Design an enzyme around this catalytic site. Structure first.
Site, PDB file in Angstrom:
ATOM      1  CB  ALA A 266      -0.963   0.016   1.195  1.00  0.00           C
ATOM      2  CD  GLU A 302       0.716   2.347   3.564  1.00  0.00           C
ATOM      3  OE1 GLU A 302       1.303   3.422   3.315  1.00  0.00           O
ATOM      4  OE2 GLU A 302       1.277   1.238   3.454  1.00  0.00           O
TER       5      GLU A 302
HETATM    6  O1  LIG Z   1       3.794  -2.028   0.824  1.00  0.00           O
HETATM    7  C1  LIG Z   1       4.870  -2.059   1.268  1.00  0.00           C
HETATM    8  C2  LIG Z   1       5.500  -3.406   1.790  1.00  0.00           C
HETATM    9  N1  LIG Z   1       6.899  -3.095   2.292  1.00  0.00           N
HETATM   10  C3  LIG Z   1       8.027  -3.208   1.341  1.00  0.00           C
HETATM   11  C4  LIG Z   1       9.288  -3.451   1.850  1.00  0.00           C
HETATM   12  C5  LIG Z   1      10.344  -3.560   0.973  1.00  0.00           C
HETATM   13  F1  LIG Z   1      11.565  -3.814   1.460  1.00  0.00           F
HETATM   14  C6  LIG Z   1      10.179  -3.460  -0.408  1.00  0.00           C
HETATM   15  C7  LIG Z   1       8.920  -3.217  -0.920  1.00  0.00           C
HETATM   16  F2  LIG Z   1       8.787  -3.111  -2.274  1.00  0.00           F
HETATM   17  C8  LIG Z   1       7.837  -3.107  -0.065  1.00  0.00           C
HETATM   18  N2  LIG Z   1       5.675  -0.841   1.412  1.00  0.00           N
HETATM   19  C9  LIG Z   1       5.117   0.422   0.962  1.00  0.00           C
HETATM   20  C10 LIG Z   1       5.131   1.485   2.021  1.00  0.00           C
HETATM   21  O2  LIG Z   1       6.118   1.762   2.648  1.00  0.00           O
HETATM   22  N3  LIG Z   1       3.842   2.100   2.250  1.00  0.00           N
HETATM   23  O3  LIG Z   1       3.802   3.103   3.224  1.00  0.00           O
HETATM   24  C11 LIG Z   1       5.646   0.846  -0.391  1.00  0.00           C
HETATM   25  C12 LIG Z   1       6.795   0.214  -0.869  1.00  0.00           C
HETATM   26  C13 LIG Z   1       7.273   0.536  -2.149  1.00  0.00           C
HETATM   27  C14 LIG Z   1       6.612   1.527  -2.895  1.00  0.00           C
HETATM   28  C15 LIG Z   1       7.106   1.799  -4.299  1.00  0.00           C
HETATM   29  C16 LIG Z   1       8.376   2.264  -4.630  1.00  0.00           C
HETATM   30  C17 LIG Z   1       8.652   2.410  -5.968  1.00  0.00           C
HETATM   31  F3  LIG Z   1       9.866   2.884  -6.336  1.00  0.00           F
HETATM   32  C18 LIG Z   1       7.728   2.079  -6.957  1.00  0.00           C
HETATM   33  F4  LIG Z   1       8.029   2.225  -8.301  1.00  0.00           F
HETATM   34  C19 LIG Z   1       6.477   1.609  -6.629  1.00  0.00           C
HETATM   35  F5  LIG Z   1       5.594   1.286  -7.650  1.00  0.00           F
HETATM   36  C20 LIG Z   1       6.170   1.451  -5.292  1.00  0.00           C
HETATM   37  C21 LIG Z   1       5.480   2.138  -2.437  1.00  0.00           C
HETATM   38  C22 LIG Z   1       4.990   1.803  -1.130  1.00  0.00           C
HETATM   39 ZN   LIG Z   2       5.649   2.980   4.282  1.00  0.00          ZN
END
Ligand SMILES: O=C(CNc1cc(F)cc(F)c1)N[C@@H](C(=O)NO)c1ccc(-c2cc(F)c(F)c(F)c2)cc1
Ligand SMILES: [Zn+2]
Ligand SMILES: [Mg+2]
Ligand SMILES: [Mg+2]
Ligand SMILES: [Mg+2]
Ligand SMILES: [Mg+2]
Length: 889
Positions: A266, A302
């Site tokens: 998310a 989030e």
């Molecule tokens: O959902 C999660 C699960 N955690 C997680 C942990 C990791 F080590 C690697 C991973 F990928 C996810 N994390 C959220 C978050 O932190 N939300 O607050 C999140 C994570 C990546 C993006 C993003 C970045 C880009 F450069 C993009 F191009 C893209 F499309 C998305 C957007 C939101």
């Molecule tokens: Zn985050």
């Protein structure tokens, strides 16, 4: 490829004060008009005006309503729009542009894209430049005024950040909505959603200002009945930030939206959080138990970004862990308080010490604040997130709750509305540290090494007890292995939460105590210790380190039975298992290497098995904890302790140890499986989506763990239990009946039964896919071919692809087949996926991360497939950069 360096940060020569967007969605294209009200910053030195803009089709660009001419006044190369400085005004000016983009064919799911029948954006980190021209970096804060137009029938619900200030009809069956968001924000928090969305809503009144906040949760119409738990979790998140941190939501509305196609879990876009449907939607009839904790953590995560990320923002992407590590820490505090189960903390440690420790000893190892990057999409890592969270949690361990809360509020009050860096947070914690130690000379300068030093520290112990003096000593040493980031590793500030257990009565011998290890070694002495204790070390897993407790198995059993700290009990069990695994592994290896006709295996410690029985039979003991103690450590945890690991020998080792314990305890296991049924499968609240009982869910975990152990053991007539389990209303149960039936002739009958139960709910079918993928089947390769042809086909949905393939890659015997057929198969899937979604293709590389830790034949097989992927002419930037680093090329 451009390498960006942390030390090179410099503010822009430009300012973007106001963004005015018109996003007109049509059948075959989307037209984006944008006016940027800009200025020249004090850092400007007459440079060209360079915008990011990736994949944009220019209709026109203008400055102060004067159309610009290509080649003479600007160049565009599909990545950067360069306006030559001669044509850049020297005071406040307006830049405007009209571009065409194509969400329908945007299968990489970055920028503006179509997920089923929903138009949705994903802009973190650098995706806003795929929507329109911008100086796409988080220190460019601007106000946003956003109008979206679309066919009213296909897209009746229009959402963006801020307040909806106008809604209007448009000739030709269209309509528009205007959203004004006056507070400054970075462009990666921009979002837009258009679709035939249905919702649940509630009103939340904040704790102190008594502001009314409208809460909305959206999905496609088919799944609107799966929205209720998410709404409850949002209310819970809101209350927890108010209660623990004193922080209230500041805006009048918060929207949560589920989409089917999402690269991750998310996204915290301000007022408009967007979710992978698998991390927002659930119902008791159509979701496994895991979904409930997942939705709670992801909604909470989030929400907690609203302060740690959205109100206090990042200067640059190198500070990513300051919002991600800190928000994971806030999310973990929240989850622990909501679940009130010890397995919540244990599950986060279990993930860190398997997945993140593997990463930190791999060629990919990096500190939580890296010094450089090429691909921002590859920058998001378990190191940044989960080691980051443990680094943020150590502040709370060191300071205690009261002073941690004081330091955290210093951080929020001083940086609210501004960008910040990791140093700013350390400074706020340092002020609380001065207060706690009553010592304005105290400092946390050494603590900063947690942000810059890569690799996992090793902490080891020796003990001395003088019975006559009643004097006890704990000698501690720390060591971090040199790697590619530091040739010489400095000692860290390591907080060691410790108890001393009286072995005669199991009681605590000292008050709560946190040793502050700041040197490579130290001796901590305790007086008036009446008898020789057993030390309880790193309680709560108080630092992200390899713990070498140097305890005998007899001491570890005593802690496992009688210690007060859940982590130390679980870790003592882990350590007993690990000693057994390494010994049996070496004995099996030697027999293989020497082609022995006969040999001996060291049996499992009988007093250890007795201690497991004692805990299992204790009705006051926790079901979730019980499930941990009958499970061997994860394969990815074990692999950190074995060089040249032969996965076949490890599979034989685990098999022997499980068989040893089962030969003594299967009757206990069976008895508990039966006696747990009534409470575990209670249906009293099955049709109340608001009633979630984490203890009951842990009892189902225990039953399903025991059923797996009994099925593998071919316990007499256990197939009767499996068949009855398949009729349970709970998907955790009837999907369990599928995977444990793998050992029986009934597997494909339950395969078909559970398929028809699953196929009409998108998310449930994906859980079914994972269950098949994970099944311990000798014909798993033919089964995967069947899933490909019959269910998966050419889906570009990341949830579908990850469900089919990732669980299988954890099949120790079959994925690592010595032919290399498993490596070949996943490499084909990666290469195929990389044509349309590089970031998901890089996720599918995960099994290769340990390649140089395996036996030499499997190292070569893995390396061959990665070199093959690297040789694809059309390889993406993401995949190339990742495999180049992973293969040490
Ligand atoms: O959902 C999660 C699960 N955690 C997680 C942990 C990791 F080590 C690697 C991973 F990928 C996810 N994390 C959220 C978050 O932190 N939300 O607050 C999140 C994570 C990546 C993006 C993003 C970045 C880009 F450069 C993009 F191009 C893209 F499309 C998305 C957007 C939101
Ligand atoms: Zn985050
Ligand atoms: Mg394009
Ligand atoms: Mg309250
Ligand atoms: Mg689908
Ligand atoms: Mg290297």
């Amino acid at each position: 490829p451009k390498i960006h360096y942390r030390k090179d940060y410099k503010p822009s020569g430009f300012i973007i004060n106001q963004v005015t967007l018109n996003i007109n969605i049509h059948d075959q294209e989307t037209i984006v008009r944008s006016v940027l009200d800009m200025d020249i910053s004090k850092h400007n030195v007459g440079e060209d005006l360079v915008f990011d803009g990736v994949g944009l089709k220019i209709n026109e660009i203008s400055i102060n309503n004067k159309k610009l001419v290509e080649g003479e006044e600007y160049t565009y190369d599909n990545e950067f729009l360069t306006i030559f400085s001669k044509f850049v005004p020297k005071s406040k000016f307006a830049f405007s542009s009209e571009v065409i983009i194509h969400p329908e064919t945007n299968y990489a799911l970055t920028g503006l894209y179509k997920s089923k029948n929903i138009i949705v954006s994903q802009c973190e980190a650098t995706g806003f430049r795929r929507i329109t021209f911008f100086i796409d970096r988080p220190d460019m804060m601007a106000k946003y005024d956003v109008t979206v137009t679309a066919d009213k029938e296909k897209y009746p619900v229009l959402l963006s950040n801020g307040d909806k200030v106008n809604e209007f009809e448009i000739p030709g069956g269209r309509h528009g909505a205007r959203f004004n968001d006056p507070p400054l924000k970075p462009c990666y928090l921009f979002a837009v959603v258009a679709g035939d969305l249905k919702h649940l809503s509630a009103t939340y009144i904040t704790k102190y200002t008594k502001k009314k906040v409208e809460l909305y949760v959206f999905s496609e119409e088919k799944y609107v009945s799966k929205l209720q738990w998410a709404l409850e979790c949002l209310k819970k998140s809101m209350a927890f930030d108010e209660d623990y941190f004193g922080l209230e939501y500041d805006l009048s509305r918060l929207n949560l939206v589920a989409v089917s196609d999402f690269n991750v879990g998310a996204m915290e876009n301000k007022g408009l959080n967007i979710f992978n449907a698998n991390s927002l939607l659930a119902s008791k009839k159509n979701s496994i138990d895991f979904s409930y904790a997942r939705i709670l953590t992801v909604v909470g995560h989030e929400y907690f970004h609203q302060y740690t990320g959205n109100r206090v923002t990042l200067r640059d992407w190198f500070q990513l862990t300051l919002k991600e590590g800190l928000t994971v820490h806030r999310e973990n505090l929240f989850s622990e308080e909501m679940t009130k189960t010890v397995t919540t903390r244990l599950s986060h440690v279990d993930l860190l010490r398997s997945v993140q420790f593997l990463e930190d000893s791999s060629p990919l190892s990096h500190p939580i604040r890296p010094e450089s990057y090429v691909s921002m999409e590859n920058f998001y890592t378990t190191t940044v997130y989960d080691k980051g969270s443990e680094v943020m949690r150590m502040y709370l361990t060191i300071l205690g709750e009261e002073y941690y809360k004081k330091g955290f509020d210093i951080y929020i009050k001083k940086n609210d509305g501004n960008t910040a860096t990791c140093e700013d947070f350390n400074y706020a914690m340092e002020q609380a540290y001065k207060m706690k130690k009553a010592d304005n000379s105290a400092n946390l300068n050494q603590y900063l090494l947690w942000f810059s030093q890569s690799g996992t520290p090793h902490v080891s112990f020796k003990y001395n007890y003088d019975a006559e003096k009643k004097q006890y000593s704990i000698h501690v040493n720390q060591y971090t292995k040199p790697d590619e980031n530091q040739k010489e590793k400095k000692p860290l500030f390591i907080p060691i939460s410790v108890g001393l257990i009286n072995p005669e009565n199991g009681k605590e011998m000292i008050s709560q105590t946190t040793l502050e290890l700041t040197k490579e070694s130290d001796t901590f002495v305790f007086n008036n210790i009446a008898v020789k204790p057993i030390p309880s070390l790193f309680r709560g897993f108080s630092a992200p380190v390899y713990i070498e407790d140097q305890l005998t198995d007899e001491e570890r059993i005593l802690l496992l039975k009688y210690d007060s700290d859940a982590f130390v009990r679980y870790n003592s069990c882990t350590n007993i298992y690990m000693k057994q695994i390494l010994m049996n592994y070496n004995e099996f290896l030697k027999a293989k290497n020497e082609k022995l006709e006969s040999f001996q295996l060291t049996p499992v410690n009988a007093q250890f098995i007795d201690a497991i029985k004692y805990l299992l039979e204790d009705p006051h003991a926790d079901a979730g904890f019980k499930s941990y103690i009958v499970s061997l450590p994860q394969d990815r945890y074990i692999i950190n302790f074995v060089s040249n690991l032969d996965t076949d020998v490890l599979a034989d080792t685990k098999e022997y140890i499980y068989k040893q314990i089962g030969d003594k305890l299967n009757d206990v296991y069976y008895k508990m499986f039966k006696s747990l049924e009534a409470k575990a499968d209670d249906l009293t609240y099955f049709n109340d989506e608001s009633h979630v009982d984490f203890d009951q869910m842990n009892m189902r975990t225990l039953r399903n763990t025991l059923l797996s152990l009994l099925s593998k053991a071919q316990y007499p007539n256990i197939l009767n239990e499996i068949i009855e389990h398949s009729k349970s209303p709970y998907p955790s149960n009837w999907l369990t009946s599928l995977s444990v039936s793998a050992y029986f002739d009934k597997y494909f009958e339950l395969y078909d039964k559970t398929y028809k139960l699953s196929k009409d709910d998108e998310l449930l079918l994906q859980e079914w896919l994972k269950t098949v993928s994970r099944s311990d089947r000798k014909d798993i390769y033919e089964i995967l071919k069947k899933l490909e042809n019959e269910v998966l086909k050419d889906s570009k949905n990341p949830n579908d692809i990850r469900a089919v393939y990732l669980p299988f890659t954890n099949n120790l015997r079959r994925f690592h087949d010595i032919s290399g057929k498993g490596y070949k198969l996943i490499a084909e899937v990666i290469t195929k996926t990389d044509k349309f979604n590089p970031m998901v293709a890089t996720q599918l590389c995960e099994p290769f991360k340990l390649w140089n830790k395996l036996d030499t034949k499997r190292q070569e097989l893995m390396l061959n497939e990665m070199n093959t992927m690297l040789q694809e002419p059309q390889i993406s930037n993401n995949l190339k950069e990742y495999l180049l680093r992973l293969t040490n090329k």
